[model samples]
Target: KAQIFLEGSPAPLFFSQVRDAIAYARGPEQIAPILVIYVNDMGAAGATWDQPGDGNWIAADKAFYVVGSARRGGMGAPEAVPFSSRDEAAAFVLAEGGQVLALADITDAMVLTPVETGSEPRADDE
Candidate 1:
């Protein structure tokens, strides 16, 4: 038996939500999740997406990452820009002026969504 948690965000996927959740599932649950599928732009671009698999894009060291900052500011919280597809992310970049970086090229570092309102916080582990 398995407990499958389907995560779909109406807004684009948040880095913290996805990463932190994945971190918990891997670190505490002791499960090596094999990333199977990811659906982006489910009718509303990157704002809507569904996660149905493990967190291999980062943990398993896959070369798939669509990093970009957020365009919407509501709850006043920063976000994570880890996307599954380059085209998806690049398209986001096309609109948001972002970049598609290979996970392999990325080193030890986290993400920070800049705020025009000014500076704020950073993150560590859970």
Candidate 2:
């Protein structure tokens, strides 16, 4: 019923099986970032999707930084902020949450980017 000793069995063979199972189970909605569309018509339609209560959008904002440390020296890491919308980044700054130093619109964003290692982060320059 099952072939365990198959070639490439322990590597991609096993992983691909799981990946396919997840794809079939999760559907498009679970994978794609939901979009909210507003239409001002006679019938009317306002924010049709997973938009926030105040008509905002949630997006992943990731920044890679290398902070200088005392004993350990420079350590690189990623800082991710999930903002409801671009405007929210400014709002957060106004609230003194932190700095909204920069913005990048990754609308056509890749749903997945598989990285083998989670150890020391890659340099921001890279």
Candidate 3:
């Protein structure tokens, strides 16, 4: 339902809704120099919730992105799941059979609503 990020970074961006964030990213920020994080925050956790960190998330260029079939990610848009290594992303693709995209090349932010089986178990309660 929302996004999270460090406050003191050179460029910080957080969103209350995934669609809003993706819309912004696919809109103006597509060409703008920036990094976006689509986080799965748990309110029942520590005070910080996400265990916010400075260099926690993998860099966009250095990360691999994956979008699988059915199921909405955190919201109604694609998850664009990030991985530190291509093997994991490839493994997910092997299981899910979705496109693997780079951060700078994320132009496939479209809505996909199929059914219940599609719920991303990683962020189940979105």
Candidate 4:
């Protein structure tokens, strides 16, 4: 699983929860960079960690993607499926379908919904 560690937090965070978690933690202030880690036994081969350009983000209205789902060993639904590279995320969208946006383009509204696909959206994620 990929874990996000915010400053001074006692526990780590789920990938799907990162945006909101940072929002809640930062309140009205602009959010700063937080630490994200890949802990699966695939051991960086999946590139969830390590290497350049690891990890990806999706549209506010799309599903929270998962990487290495088939042979990831005990990994299951509602997990963070970030792209290991830009191409990887693009491939997922081409095959599974989604509108991919750049990291800076993913607004707070995009991440406010549930990680699963087909969830209703607000004016932003909508």
Tens-digit lDDT string for candidate 3 (1-126): 234233344565655443344345554463344445554321111102232222233454445556565333535444455555667666766776366666555543323444445655233311
lDDT of 2: 0.24
Task: Tell me how far the alpha carbon of residue 62 in candidate 3 is from the true structure, in angstroms, after superposition.
Answer: 3.5
Best-performing candidate as measured by TM-score: 3
Candidate number of the best lDDT: 3
Model 1, poorest ten-residue lDDT window?
Answer: 36-45
Query: 2 or 4: which has the higher TM-score?
Result: 4
lDDT of each: 0.35, 0.24, 0.45, 0.37
What TM-score would every model get versus the actual structure? 0.36, 0.21, 0.46, 0.35
Model 4 per-residue lDDT tens digits across residues 39-64: 23221233333423333432322232
Residue 32's lDDT in candidate 4: 34
Give me the displacement of residue 84 in model 2, in angstroms: 3.8
In candidate 2, which residue pairs clash? 57-84
Write down the lDDT that model 4 would get: 0.37
Q: Which ten residues in a row have the lowest lDDT in candidate 3?
A: 40-49
Model 2 agreement with the true structure over 1-126: per-residue lDDT tens digits: 000122222321111121122122223323333232111111001111222233222211222111112211112222222343445444543443233332232211112223424322232211
Model 1 has an lDDT value of 0.35
* Cα deviation of 68, candidate 1, in Å: 2.0
Local error of candidate 4 at 90, Å?
0.5
lDDT of 2 at 110: 19
Question: Which portions of model 2 miss their true places by more than 4 Å?
Answer: 1-80, 101-126
